[PDB]
Write a protein that binds this ligand. Structure first.
Ligand SMILES: [Zn+2]
Ligand SMILES: [Zn+2]
Lengths: 134, 87, 38, 138, 196, 114, 97
């Protein structure tokens, strides 16, 4: 027991967690309020020999997000956290990886184009000057 | 080159840091170009037409200006930031 | 008569009875492939 | 049975702030990392540079156990974010953004040749004999 | 040679700002990949290919002595165009060389070593395929391997050299006045004839 | 042919002989670690190297629009009439004129040579 | 814009993958930088081609090259590339009507 000791209790319990890759707009909407304690519901549907994961955006947040799972046997992932009181702990071990994709295809690029244009605002360009500086 | 490369080159240049102990910084941000101008003997600027450059053996050149922000620190918990627009 | 022609090679018995017993074969194998003339 | 058609849906919560930050720890598959023997471990910043902008050093079971070094992922997730779902008694998923991504690899422990010693071997680097013997002499 | 032809053909790297080339595996050691499996994973993506594995054996033996990242960095620093006075400074110089001078297009950030190892391994992987005859050698005459420097890029090449002189000139002008104790005039510090 | 890596430091394992037992052992360097060799062959090189090109051929080539396609060589695995044929055109062969066929049916990357 | 779109689609970053996955996947190069790997090269090229032809995210002068044999997709955006306009043909028919 010391300051640098790692609380490996989470590893002992073999707690499982899911790693999800999501776009910025979904997180940006969450970052808008980020304090209401609710951003949506995660729905998982399973069949006899197939499983599908999808996420629905909150109606208030807006004012379909299908999920695709990925193999995790090629790399072993673990999640750990550092406490502000200098007490590191291991939350658990990743058991599945998922990715989020946009339901729309055509108009979705329009939102991306705005982001690319928005990120282009700091891109300064030379300005033509009508009158020579005196 | 004029619209992007010149501005990127100026932006990508590292700020000039100088220490005496007063400290001086120079940061170049915005690049301006005027239309090709020719200065007469009296010093009066005038637009330079390409034919006049050809006839009078002039160089068809446009003045280049850069906005320079200078910040000086004199270890006296005061910072003075003066900007020279269109240098 | 055999469809495959073979030639087994081993180091002298006197030396067996200094460089390396394994690497030396590679040096011989590379040396015999090119330097040796049939 | 129910498992053949079970459907599960849980609420998602995004707390504004957490006392402890969340970052991903990645181990290569070939490492065969096992936590059963991880009785004790130590994680601290490196001292080679001699803080928040330096690599992380991981030690397991003191000097006896394996030592791993973590390096921050150079590629930034400007257009991407990572979230982790953790089971809770209330039954609602909780997502925490990934503050950092770290890649850890094992560090071998043994009498590694020193910089001064390597100088002598550089003479025989082109022509060396019995690669096994070089370590025995050291 | 006796042992020269036994190991086979070894791969070296000619990094910028180094007088003499270094073994390829050493560069991987400097980048932070010590174990052979970790290095080979960035070079050979299919371990089931015995042909590729043999091609890297001589390279591994050449850099067998160097077994630590700091040892490898010192070796790279020792051969630098400006050898360090002490061992510690040599490592710092080698780190800077790989950080910025080596494969800069991959990255220049302090945490881009992994990306540079993959691309460097890809360079080795591409070399092995050419050596193994699996991929045809690149054609210099092939015109998709060519680029045309038009007026813009040509002018941009001049501007940075001329802008660096401008920034150097103002540094020199300001340093004289700052050392003298008096502030300097920015307008007077700029030499307009440098760019014009 | 098999390449073995140490289980301690993940370094190369090189062949070694133990005079006590006279059995090939793959011993790690700078790791005082040893393993029981089983292949019994430490080195092999094929000068002729009659390596099959079909193993090298990638089934994805069937999607190449620049390759010729023939209906006269149906796929054996699935019977698809269409096939994409090409030459190895790889160095070290010295004679590259025979055609290798790849089935164009999706999900059937069958490769064969006549 | 190319890198942002590639990350959004099913392209795995080099840092976040194990080397064992690189064998089957196709390397993705953007301006000579190995950005990542992708498991469905054919679909990606169709998507990349579609965007360029619609001029949505990919400008006209961006060249996407897939080396099917080498399992590599090379995307080039830099200057100095010489190109010419060619009529697009689909299903043995000109899209020009
Ligand atoms: Zn070992
Ligand atoms: Zn078929």
């Amino acid at each position: 027991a010391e300051r640098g000791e790692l609380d490996l209790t989470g590893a002992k319990q073999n707690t499982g967690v899911w790693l999800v890759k999501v776009p910025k707009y979904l997180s940006q909407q969450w970052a808008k309020a980020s304090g209401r304690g609710e951003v949506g519901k995660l729905r998982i549907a399973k069949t006899q020999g197939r499983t599908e994961v999808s996420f629905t955006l909150n109606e208030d947040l807006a004012n379909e997000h299908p999920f695709v799972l990925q193999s995790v046997g090629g790399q072993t992932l673990t999640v750990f956290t550092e406490s502000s009181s200098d007490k590191l702990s291991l939350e658990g071990i990743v058991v599945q990886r998922a990715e989020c994709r946009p339901a729309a295809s055509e108009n979705y690029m329009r939102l991306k184009r705005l982001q690319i244009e928005e990120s282009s605002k700091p891109v300064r360009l030379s300005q033509q000057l009508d009158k020579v500086v005196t | 080159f004029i619209q992007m490369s010149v501005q990127r080159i100026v932006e990508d240049a590292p700020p000039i840091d100088l220490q005496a102990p007063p400290r001086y910084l120079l940061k170049f941000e915005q690049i301006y170009l005027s239309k090709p101008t020719h200065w007469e003997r009296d010093g009066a600027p005038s637009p330079m037409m390409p034919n006049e450059a050809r006839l009078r053996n002039l160089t068809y050149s446009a003045p280049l200006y850069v906005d320079i922000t200078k910040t000086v620190i004199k270890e006296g918990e005061e910072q003075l930031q003066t900007q020279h627009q269109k240098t | 008569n055999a469809e495959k022609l073979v030639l087994r090679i081993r180091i002298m018995n006197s030396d067996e009875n200094k460089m390396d017993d394994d690497v030396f074969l590679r040096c011989i194998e590379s040396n015999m492939l090119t330097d040796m003339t049939l | 049975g129910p498992s053949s058609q079970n459907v599960t849906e849980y609420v998602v919560r995004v707390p504004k702030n957490t006392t402890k930050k969340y970052n991903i720890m990645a181990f290569n598959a070939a490492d065969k990392v096992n936590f059963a023997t991880w009785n004790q471990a130590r994680l601290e910043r490196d001292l080679s540079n001699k803080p928040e902008d330096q690599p992380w050093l991981l030690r397991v079971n003191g000097k006896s156990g394996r030592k791993f070094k973590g390096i921050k992922k150079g590629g930034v997730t400007e257009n991407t974010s990572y979230y982790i779902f953790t089971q809770c008694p209330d039954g609602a998923f909780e997502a925490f953004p990934v503050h950092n991504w770290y890649n850890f690899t094992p560090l071998a422990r043994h009498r590694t040749l020193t910089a001064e010693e390597a100088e002598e071997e550089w003479e025989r680097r082109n022509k060396v004999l019995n690669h096994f013997s070089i370590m025995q002499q050291r | 040679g006796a042992k020269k032809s036994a190991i086979g053909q070894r791969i070296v790297a000619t990094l910028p700002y180094i007088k003499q080339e270094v073994p390829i595996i050493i560069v991987f050691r400097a980048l932070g990949f010590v174990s052979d499996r970790d290095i080979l994973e960035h070079i050979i993506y299919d371990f089931e290919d015995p042909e590729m594995m043999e091609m890297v054996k001589p390279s591994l033996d050449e850099a067998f002595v160097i077994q630590e990242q700091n040892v490898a960095l010192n070796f790279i620093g020792s051969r630098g165009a400006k050898p360090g006075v002490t061992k510690e400074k040599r490592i710092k110089y080698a780190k800077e060389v790989l950080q910025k001078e080596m494969l800069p297009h991959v990255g220049v950030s302090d945490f881009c070593e992994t990306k540079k190892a993959y691309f460097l391994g890809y360079m080795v992987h591409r070399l092995l395929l050419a050596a193994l005859g699996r991929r045809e050698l690149d054609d210099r005459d092939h015109y998709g391997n060519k680029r045309l420097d038009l007026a813009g890029p040509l002018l941009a090449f001049l501007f940075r050299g001329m802008f660096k002189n401008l920034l150097k000139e103002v540094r020199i002008y300001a340093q004289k006045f700052i050392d003298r104790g008096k502030d300097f005039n920015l307008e007077l510090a700029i030499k307009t004839r440098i760019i014009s | 042919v098999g390449i073995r890596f140490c289980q301690e430091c993940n370094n190369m394992l090189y062949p070694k002989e133990d005079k006590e037992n006279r059995i090939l052992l793959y011993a790690c360097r700078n790791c005082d670690y040893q393993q029981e060799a089983d292949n019994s062959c430490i080195y092999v090189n094929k000068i002729t190297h009659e390596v099959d090109e079909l193993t090298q051929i990638i089934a994805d080539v069937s999607q190449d629009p620049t390759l010729p396609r023939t209906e006269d060589h149906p796929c054996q695995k699935c019977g698809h009439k269409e096939a994409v044929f090409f030459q190895s055109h790889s160095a070290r062969a010295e004679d590259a004129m025979r055609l290798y066929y790849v089935c164009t049916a999706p999900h059937c990357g069958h490769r064969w040579t006549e | 814009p190319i890198l942002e779109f590639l990350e959004e689609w099913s392209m795995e970053n080099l840092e976040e993958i194990s080397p064992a996955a690189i064998a089957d996947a196709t390397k993705i190069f953007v301006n000579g930088c190995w950005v990542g790997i992708h498991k469905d090269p054919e679909q990606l090229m169709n998507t990349l081609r579609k965007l360029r032809r619609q001029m949505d995210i990919i400008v006209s002068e961006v060249s996407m090259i897939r080396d099917i044999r080498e399992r590599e997709i090379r995307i080039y955006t830099d200057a100095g590339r010489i190109c010419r306009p060619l009529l697009i043909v689909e299903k043995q028919k000109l899209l020009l009507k």
